[model samples]
Target chain A: HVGCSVDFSKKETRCGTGVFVYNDVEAWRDRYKYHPDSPRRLAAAVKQAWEDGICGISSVSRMENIMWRSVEGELNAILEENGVQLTVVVGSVKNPMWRGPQRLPVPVNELPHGWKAWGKSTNNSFVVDGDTLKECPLKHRAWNSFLVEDHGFGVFHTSVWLKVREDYSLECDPAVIGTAVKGKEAVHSDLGYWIESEKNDTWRLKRAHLIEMKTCEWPKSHTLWTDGIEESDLIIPKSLAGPLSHHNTREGYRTQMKGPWHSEELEIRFEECPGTKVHVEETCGTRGPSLRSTTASGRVIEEWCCRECTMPPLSFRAKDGCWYGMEIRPRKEPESNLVRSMVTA
Target chain B: HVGCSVDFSKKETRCGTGVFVYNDVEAWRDRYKYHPDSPRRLAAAVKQAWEDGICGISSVSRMENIMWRSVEGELNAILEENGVQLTVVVGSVKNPMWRGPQRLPVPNNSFVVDGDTLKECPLKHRAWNSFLVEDHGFGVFHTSVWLKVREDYSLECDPAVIGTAVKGKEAVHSDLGYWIESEKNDTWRLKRAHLIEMKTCEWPKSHTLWTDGIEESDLIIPKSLAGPLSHHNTREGYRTQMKGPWHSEELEIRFEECPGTKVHVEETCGTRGPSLRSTTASGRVIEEWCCRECTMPPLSFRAKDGCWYGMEIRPRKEPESNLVRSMVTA
Candidate 1:
């Protein structure tokens, strides 16, 4: 027979073994008195193990005791997976603050012994640890590499880091920019800059930053225009060159090399998360601007400009001051004067 | 007399005030020996101006001289424009390495009276002055303020600041984000985050950014599922809120009160450039994602997503970890 029990404090819902669907709560209790592996009997066993110093317990109000034998199978597996050799009999600790699934990764076999929770020598560096600080040396190493090397951080010589504001008007944001572009679609006329960045040893197209057509409208339009202008942008952030890179197609993006090198048509594709839009339906290339007359009453006049699909054999400068190669291949010269391209989905 | 005179070193084209198409060469040289102020005789006069420190010559092979009158008009203007009160006549310094224009801001009446060029007490406080330094206070103030506020920097305390690559693998580009939107027009996505500092903040109809949409390829279904992908962009630079209480338009973008108060949006407009494309004769709202079936062969299906009109309101976290209200109200 099987039974289901849940730890409300830890919000754990577990299905366990060894229980017939019994209607009599008191009868089941009576039978468990004589039973060697009953819940009541297991409590006695857990008390013995706790006294043996092989295991520790915290916040006993949830069950007031541990049921060690029932969870031994699961605990042993955790030890084997991580090459841990501890022989301690342990039970789960529950937190009362949450009612949802406590799905956090329970880091096991962590700290090395005798390491007192000391600070930056003695100052308790910014944070104080809790009693059950599980130490995972492997995970710790991974996180350290990420911070120092990946994040470009220097040694933390300061004992503490706190912020103070002397002037409210002064800037408060970190000078570092995490990611540049935001939202789904960005629109502006053909008056912005083409930003470039170096990726994988080759210059790549990064940002197609758009700017307002005009600037500075006395007081009202000031922020709209002035906010877009700036001095020097240090480096460019990372982004996918184009959705085409993810498409599983033989056709690839071709562009000019920075200098002298012939333009290459490299078939690029990422193994995972390839362009989610599996459709490869696109036609692009156009003549100079066209005036399309629509049947919508008042002589509808819509104009189209050159939709450039490729770059000439030269490097263009981006808004961030980096040079980039073209991302698409220009299929036609359109009308020689007004070089354009047509694109369609 | 027809004579052709040329300056050998520095090539210059100047319209002079003499020599009415002279045809005689050696004869003109013979008569030019004693005539004063004549173009033919002025070569000797130029040597004297150089000795007086009133006018100077460089790359002497070029014309071997200069006329004091032609240059005096230009030099006097530079002093007047900078409001310089100089009693001393200065000669131009020659930089052989440079052949183009030597256009440099010549500071006027610098700290010569201070007489002390000591360390911090008078050495311009981390600044050193040479004979080449110019003193234009107004222009200098404009440059210093731009450096401090715009560059996000502090004056270096050390004498040398060199980058050490013992740091990482090779290089780590600055991680500052120029724009936050990564994908298609994501409008009104997150609300708790108040995105400020970006002007006309938007993630609107990109590809609308493409200047000339059709500039190349040929006949194969030009609009066939590809137009949304690649294109061009115009520019990138810097801006200001307003020219302090100037224009007559009642448009002023006032954010927070600044002295510990919540930010507010005061709607503003300009006579121009205020979403210049905002005539919005374009009907852009869509009813969910809809796929339109095409009549042409294998790739006959085209899918279109909802296109919203207004910009999305999102909270942006700045680099300094501060949540600033939008610098430009939406």
Candidate 2:
């Protein structure tokens, strides 16, 4: 639909910077084909049509007709964006509406399958149903459903159901440290999570570290790891695999000390014990390793010992349920020559 | 001397809130004796004198005489505060002055005993000396000594020498923490240092902790301690007198460690080893004790170890010539 209206008194006015001007109606129509559903595009086309003296040919008796067509075209673009279809019929304004003139309600069957009905009040918007409107007498004056069958002058509307999909299966591989992945973006379905693709279209989800995922669901089957390996599968470097410091305990068990190493630089391998977990914690400028086991009914058994060079050995249970112990030794080798020389000098 | 000037055009003006309105000249004179050297006091006196209709009787010819006396009184108060004595002489402004009256210079002997001469320039202020003025030829245009003799009219100034004594010896008893004492104020002579007095007039200098003393001299004789006791004299509380943790060294030296104690609550008493000092330093949430000896030529021998409950011991020499040692056991 195409129509134009101009106020002759505003002769000095010119089109705004965003308005597209054309030499003829055919040029404007050709540009309109690309964004025909856009209200802004239709307004630009109508502005050009008015500039071309299309309104000057109109008579005073037909001024109302020109206004109604222009309003209809603008409303159609707006409703189309909102997933609604618009239909206009010309009739007398004083005709009594069959569906109670103030508001018109559509039956549930008339709506598209599986689309939820909604209503808007002056103060609130809510999900709509036949009983909801009937229960709230005050809402009768303020509320109206989205679907409108008729206005007094024969305006009708129908909405197309649009459902947002939230459920999507996601999978991720182990993350590579100190490497940048190109084309990674945040996922729309899950907040605080990102998606990146590798070669052969392998997708990865970068779980948000330290972010609480209350709104989004985390898949139970997905597994993630740092350095592309499980903690138990890690190999200790030879430089860090020096002889463990040993000390005899009064409890009649021998304890050995491992590392007082930097938390980031050191990794340890251990046999995975069922119902047991290992955690590395930092205290007093050093990381300490601890092991904890939980019973079936939720009781936890744990022991903590330091990795600080001077700290005592930690005693813990082995995978075979035997009591074994270790402690943290300094990362650097002891200087025997320097100590001897200092004593002699 | 009292005088007043009033602008009849501004008669709607009244005294400000801070101005004291007096009933009569007797009441004003009674209040004037207390702060006679204050310029504001003299101004208040003049303001009241004017309100008493003293300005109404003034003839146009006598206005300059009244103005001169009021200016003299105000200048006297200001000069007194600055430690200067002023002498006014009245004469014609056009008279050719003696002693080259553009800027007057006073002789050093004329100044009070031991007073340092000072001068001010248009942009700077410095210690004034006759030789300094001669050495910097350009300063003659902008510089003037504080002592002024004659302006083209009659004005004379002489400053009293005031020497600030900063060499007063200070002594302080050990500080008593967690107590409040009255009548304690900061020392004017020493910056970042405070002086407090005991009942028998024993004075104390509270040294500024963590403040570098670059400007003021600190007396080496003044020894202050926290908790009112020397570290060597402190008695360990029974609660903190737990058994020392011991560890064997591979070098056959049996070392003993004292504590993994809080820096504030823990106190250790060690025999004072001459030429050797003890220092307590904090690391990783606990304070560790260490000892060091400095040789005659400034060579330092030191060792540090933790008292953090689970750490190892520190080894160091004892007081005797023998190789006796102790270590910090965490």
Candidate 3:
């Protein structure tokens, strides 16, 4: 809180004056030395030092300190507003990876669920080529797996950009383009496959635009996309999306080529996730709509929670039950009594 | 693989003229433009250029390049020694938090299992406060819970560091220093109530150690730790282990004055963890033997393996299942 009120609508003006403290503003203000007698004088001085870096407040070069604290103080306020905690850990040289007791595990498991499929037979029964397009599941944001040769039939593993309905259900709605599934011994194209069937009374199978894994000049690296929804839903890469961005082939059907497509923002809905509120921003990039930032409103309830004692750094048991946060910082002081005693003994 | 092999024992020797193409010696030396005809001549020129930024074999730069490639290529070699795939992702802006789908869940439940005994009957028993210390199950590295008011005798939550042996065993080997369980409606000093006592002892608990959630010359925001291991062997943060830097009060157990404590080194033998070979280095500081560096030989499978894939990360009907490794590179 400061003496002069701000006209935030005209943020670039003298509205910029006045110091905004991040922590216990009143307490810090109470100890303010060289306190200006008037708000206007203070505002003017605040702007001057903010621009010229004239002084600091607490650990100042001895003067014009209001601007200094407020500037950084304002930053701290913004961070905390978003529930951000700034942690700085030491131990360099040897600890280049910053490997301490607190380093969280790297992306270890396969990745978000649903991307890859199985190679076994009973499970491979979904391989019906042609108009019988196998629908990608809604729960999985992305899926990737080889279509194992089951019986005398085989299929290509598919990867595609997905779309969500107004009701939050998802579909492989993007056109299957390019040579998504590179097939030599395989059967389908980027789109769907060709199963033997009757066309003009004779047996036949056909193909059309489905989707291409490499539709554009994008690598198979994990890319992030925003679904533009109410709860700031995102399509983060579950596992590395692809490399063998290839599909199989089908009988009698050949994939037709496609030209160009698209413009204008389309509406798509996303369901609100249960645990937290995520704030997000999006912007159009050469690749399409991308996320600018994403912040959450609740504490990450990774494991367990405090059932009884309501306190800070609240406790909770993880659903999948392992441990708490990853080791990103030292678990305690650099040296613990465990080590101290061991060394002494 | 360079042309001239120098005495490796004297690692600083240039030999000084031999063309040591880090990758392929013979090939790189052939392309040497400033090739001196003889050894003495080559040595002199090498000393000159190496000191300054002189000549480089394509293999010199090239050799360093390849060995560099393989060295790192070897590191990449090592990471993929067992064949692992590396992926890259993009998207950057002020979301400095790097928030994404993979962020493991946040705090959503209550903590410290079965501490206050029970809310149903009387109080959750604190079996004993002495040598019969309850073995901290391998599951919890540290657990913090309120000191339940036994039969209407309420108390503040207490946090303490704990250690258990391989089996379910306990030890109060380490001194329970300071006023570890501070009290009052809440205030200064750190230390708690209940000395080593009898189960049936009419022990009316007294206390201290007002948990001043914040008080320190630190910003290493007390963080958490977990080492993904066998059976998902995780080393969760049990309790914060403080230092010799003292602070105190509360009755005869009052942590009084001390001119000095230790002025030496301490040897600590951490249990050999199940993962890769963890080569550790140590040296002395005022704090005694501090860790220098620790490098691992391989990955701890818990995070990447299919061991208890059947276990937590809570196996869904998992549309599909299979042994997880498909090393595209080795």
Candidate 4:
């Protein structure tokens, strides 16, 4: 019940772009159901979270629960495989500045535990049990990491953001390459580029990452020509690069040498489901309204069946007639609808 | 075998540039197997030879033989995926330049079946016989392509050469990058880019690729940098977009409508062995000799995992360094 009281009724209690993110719904249930052989379950849970490089799942949802189950298995496997014993689990917790109930009068603490030294140490304590907060917690809560590279962190710190209205554009579609001499094939002719993350090492729990992709061919070609171009991309929510997504590859790998280890054990979990859950494939509006809010009315049109391979219905929209577009299918992750490789060399 | 004969008669054909190429070796093997497949392999073989994608397989003699067995299979699989069928296998008998031990040079007309208008009628006879040929009747010397793009190609038609060189070098390694603040806890930085496919697409297939991954204090500070500055790309090959071997996954994709069938072929096998094959993990030299005649040697040696990679090595003695300086590990 300690988490039941963060009085939004008072002005002094809140400060800066504050936000309240929800944790996994099953965490309290699992904790409540703690068993005596629970040592086996608890040890297994803790180890599975760390050893197997688990990222997104936190506490007790089905996915995160399965990860906890593997803790014992991975630790034992490592002991047998290389005579080593190391456990590592990592995830992220995001607190957006906007949304939520109070409209975030001031900036929220970037790191979940950053509020530890704040004014409320006596009553309900700022950083409740080290990482998780009892009240006004962060959103998009994920597992935590045992290593620096594995955590949603930078050497300095990390901040979660939505980055609405601010995004980078300009791009090309892989499909426009025409034919080449017989036996010789055409290669990717795209020479244009938009600004992207130049750094892959630092980590963050959630970032606005509003970088957009547009598929454009030269407005002019040898035979015919193309026309005025514009691009559109989805403004994805919290994303981290570590156990959740390591080096752009999802399946986490362990090497003989990991740079350095810094464990910031904050628990994160998703309260509201990510994207919408639907079966039939339809193009999700691409250029949706983000001015004040985004809704079905202002959704941008996207291509249906563009990237039907990996989805449960996804859609994407490129700049006007350009061709390249990738939109989150209102699902867990965003996938490109257009297979630009088909037109490639 | 035609290739054996050519190899024995070294006086006529000098050494080709050693830079291993894709199609050349297979074309030579079609020569080794002789007849039927040889002439068909002519164009690709020459292209491979020009690129030096070939070399004798010292690992095993049966290597080339085994590769030949897989050749047509791999070819058809690729074409089949594209919805193309394997029809006629036109070859040596189609090449006009493929004259037998000539009947004392010309006009005797003793040996040639149709010497009078051979060039024009080279594959005409094969077409009559329901197949096609552009030269003397050497059945194995061959190629199987879409009959459409098969130009009025004759044995007389030379594979006109277009020159390019092979080399992989870089001007700088750890050029400093610039960083900027994004509120708190988050920061962004960008390298001025000393060299990248981004700034220079025209730069040949990856002679090199370098990345500096930083952590702490945002992208402003660096901790680890890769050795040899390159990687074994998961990417398919030199795309129409850029040359070399490095793949990126920032959502770059292509899609196109189907065009009518064209076998669109390139030589992938070799006359010899792989570019480089090592006996051990750390010290083996597979594909290491790719240093063709180039002005500079691999300035930055990436002592990474020994994965066989191909950089368009270099043209011939076009580089004095190729003739002398490069450390000959192969």
Per-prediction fnat values? 0.00, 0.00, 0.00, 0.00
lDDT tens digits by residue: candidate 3, B1-330: 011122222222111110010111112223322211232332333233333422221111121222223233223323333333321111111100110111111111111111121342122221111111122221111222111112222211111212101100100111121111222121122221211110111101011111122222221111111100111111121112111001111111122211121112122322211111011122111111111122111111121111111010111121112323222110
Candidate lDDT values, in order: 0.20, 0.21, 0.18, 0.21
Look at candidate 3 and tell me the lDDT of residue B272: 18
Interface RMSD for all numbered candidates: 40.2, 40.4, 32.7, 30.3
Task: Write candidate 4's Cα lDDT for A170-277 as tens digits.
Answer: 111112111011011101111111111112222111211111112122211110101111111111211111111111111111120111011111121111123233
Q: Is candidate 3 or candidate 4 better by lDDT?
A: 4
Q: In candidate 1, what are the lDDT values of residues B1-330, reduced to their tens digit? A: 011222223232111111111111112112211111233222223333323332222211111112232334444454445444432222332211011111111113221111122221232221111011111111111111111101122221110111100011111101011111111112111011111111111112211222123232321111221111112111011112111111111121211121211212222311111111111224322122111221111111111211111111111121211211122211
**Tens digit of lDDT per residue, candidate 1, span A251-277?**
133322121111111111122121111
Residue runs of model 2 more than 4 Å from their true location after superposition: A1-119, A122-190, A193-209, A214-345, B1-330
Error of 1 at B46 (Å): 27
Question: DockQ of candidates 1 onward, in order?
Answer: 0.00, 0.00, 0.01, 0.01
Candidate 4 overall Cα lDDT vs. reference? Answer: 0.21
Q: What is the TM-score of chain A alone in each candidate?
A: 0.16, 0.16, 0.12, 0.16
Q: Which numbered prediction scores highest in DockQ against the true structure?
A: 4
Residue lDDT tens for model 4, B122-188: 4222111111222221112223321111333232111111011111110111100111111101211
For model 2, the interface Cα RMSD in angstroms equals 40.4
DockQ of 4: 0.01
For model 3, the stretches where C-alpha displacement exceeds 4 angstroms are: A1-44, A47-345, B1-239, B242-288, B293-330
Give candidate 1's fnat, 2 decimals. 0.00
Q: Against the true structure, what is each candidate's TM-score?
A: 0.17, 0.12, 0.13, 0.20
Candidate 1 to truth, TM: 0.17
